[PDB]
C-alpha cells in the first residue's frame, strides 16, 4: 500500500464533511473567493476605477457594497498580484480592482471543484450523477456572464461587479444597451425558470394533498385530478421527476447562449420592418417603438456616469426627453 | 466543556480588539489605499482620480496620491 492508496483512503474516510479529491480544488478556491468578496466589500474601495464609494469604510450600506470591476484601461489583463500592473504592491493591486479578478477566478475553480465533487460523491454512493448534469447549468451561466461577456467586450470593466446594486446596474445596463428582454434566448431562459418554480410548487402541493392515510401518495388520484382539472397529467413518476430536472436546466442553457450572443453585440436589438415603417410615417406607434425610446433615454442618461472613463459630455440639449 | 473556555475567553476579545484597533488607528487606510474622509478631495481637488493607462497604473495612482 503506497502513499497514494493511504492518501486516497484518508480522503474518502467518513467525517462531518466529505473531502474527496475534489476538495483539494474546491475548498481552497471557494474559501479564497468568499474571502476576496468579504475583503473587497469591507475595506477596498472603487474610488479610482468607477469613482464610487463601495465599501464599509466609505460608509456604504449592505445593499451598496460591491467588489467593483477593474478599470477600463487595463483591457482584459489578468491582474496578477505580481503582474506588470500590480508589480507586487498589494495596495495598488487592490486599488486597480484586482480583487474582482481574484474573486471571479477562484469562483470559477470553486464551481469546477463542486461539479467534480458531485461526480465523486455519486461515484461513491453508486447512483446516476444526474446532480452533476443539473449543476452544469449554473456553471454555464457563470462562465457566460462573468467570463465570456467581459471578454467579448472592451474590458473587465463591463462585467457584473460583485454586489447587489451593482448587479442591478448590470441588469439595467444590459436592457439599455443590448435590449436583452427582446432576445429570444432570454425568453426561453425566463420560461425555464418560471416553469421550474411552477413545477416545484404544484408538485409539492399535489404530493401533500394526495397523501395516503398512514411511494407514499396516490399517483392514481393525482393523475385523475390533474387530467380532469387541467387536461393533461403525468402518468409516469420517472418522467415527472426527470422533467422537473430538465426544465430549469434547459432554461439556464438557453439564457447562456443568449448571453454569449450579446457578448459580441450579436444582439436582437430591433425589428427591421418596424423601424422602416416608423420611418415612413410618424403616427405609427407601438409598444416596441416606445421600448426603443426608453432604451435611448437610459443609454443617454446612464453613459456619462456609468462609463466615467470615456469622459462623455452630453449637454442638456442632446438628452432625449418626452418634450 | 470547561477547558477551552479559558482559551477562548483569553483570545476571542483580543482578536476583536485587534480588528478594532486595525480600523481605529487608521492602519486600514494605508493597507488598502482607501482614502480618509478628507482624502477624497482636497479643498478644491474635486477631479476624479481615474486611471487612464494600463501599463503604469500604480505610478499614475502615486501621482493621484
Amino acid at each position: 500500500r503506497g502513499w497514494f492508496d493511504v492518501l486516497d483512503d484518508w480522503l474518502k474516510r467518513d467525517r462531518f464533511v466529505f473531502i474527496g479529491w475534489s476538495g483539494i480544488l474546491l475548498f481552497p478556491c471557494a474559501f479564497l473567493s468568499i474571502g476576496g468578496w468579504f475583503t473587497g466589500t469591507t475595506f477596498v474601495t472603487s474610488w479610482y476605477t468607477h469613482g464610487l464609494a463601495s465599501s464599509y469604510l466609505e460608509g456604504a450600506n449592505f445593499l451598496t457594497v460591491a467588489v467593483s470591476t477593474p478599470a477600463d484601461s487595463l483591457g482584459h489583463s489578468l491582474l496578477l498580484l505580481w503582474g506588470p500592473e500590480a508589480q507586487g504592491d498589494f495596495t495598488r493591486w487592490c486599488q486597480l480592482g484586482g480583487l474582482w479578478n481574484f474573486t471571479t477566478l477562484h469562483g470559477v475553480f470553486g464551481l469546477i471543484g463542486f461539479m467534480l465533487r458531485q461526480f465523486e460523491i455519486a461515484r461513491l454512493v453508486g447512483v446516476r450523477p444526474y446532480n452533476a448534469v443539473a449543476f452544469s447549468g449554473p456553471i454555464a451561466v457563470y462562465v457566460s456572464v462573468f467570463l465570456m461577456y467581459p471578454l467579448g467586450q472592451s474590458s473587465w470593466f463591463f462585467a457584473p461587479s460583485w454586489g447587489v446594486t451593482s448587479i442591478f446596474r448590470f441588469l439595467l445596463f444590459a436592457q439599455g444597451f443590448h435590449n436583452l428582454t427582446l432576445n429570444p434566448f432570454h425568453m426561453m431562459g425566463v420560461a425555464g425558470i418560471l416553469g421550474g418554480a411552477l413545477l416545484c410548487a404544484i408538485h409539492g402541493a399535489t404530493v401533500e394533498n394526495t397523501l395516503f392515510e398512514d411511494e407514499t401518495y396516490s399517483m392514481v388520484t393525482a393523475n385523475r385530478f390533474w387530467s380532469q382539472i387541467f387536461g393533461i397529467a403525468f402518468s409516469n413518476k420517472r418522467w415527472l421527476h426527470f422533467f422537473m430536472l430538465f426544465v430549469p436546466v434547459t432554461g439556464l442553457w438557453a439564457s447562456a447562449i443568449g448571453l454569449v450572443g450579446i457578448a459580441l453585440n450579436m444582439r436582437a436589438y430591433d425589428f427591421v420592418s418596424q423601424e422602416i415603417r416608423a420611418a415612413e410615417d410618424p403616427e405609427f406607434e407601438t409598444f416596441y417603438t416606445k421600448n426603443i425610446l426608453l432604451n435611448e433615454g437610459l443609454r443617454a442618461w446612464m453613459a456619462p456616469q456609468d462609463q466615467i472613463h470615456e469622459n462623455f459630455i452630453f449637454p442638456e440639449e442632446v438628452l432625449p426627453r418626452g418634450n | 466543556s470547561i477547558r477551552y473556555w479559558i482559551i477562548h475567553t483569553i483570545t476571542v476579545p483580543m482578536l476583536f480588539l485587534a480588528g478594532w484597533l486595525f480600523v481605529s488607528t487608521g492602519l486600514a487606510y494605508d493597507v488598502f489605499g482607501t482614502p480618509r474622509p478628507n482624502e477624497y478631495f482636497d479643498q478644491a481637488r474635486q477631479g476624479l482620480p481615474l486611471v487612464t493607462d494600463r501599463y503604469e497604473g500604480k505610478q499614475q495612482i502615486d501621482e493621484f496620491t
Binding site: 468579504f38 464599509y56 469604510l57 | 476571542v12 482578536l15 476583536f16 480588539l17 480588528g19 478594532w20 480600523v23
Partner: peptide
Amino acid sequence: IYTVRWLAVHTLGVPLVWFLGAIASMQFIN
C-alpha cells in the same frame, strides 16, 4: 488534537471575528 475540523473551524472563525470587530469599529466613526 489538530484535527482537520479544528483547522476548518479556525480558518472560518478567526477572520470572521476580526472582520466583525473591524465593522463594529467602523460603526462608531464620525
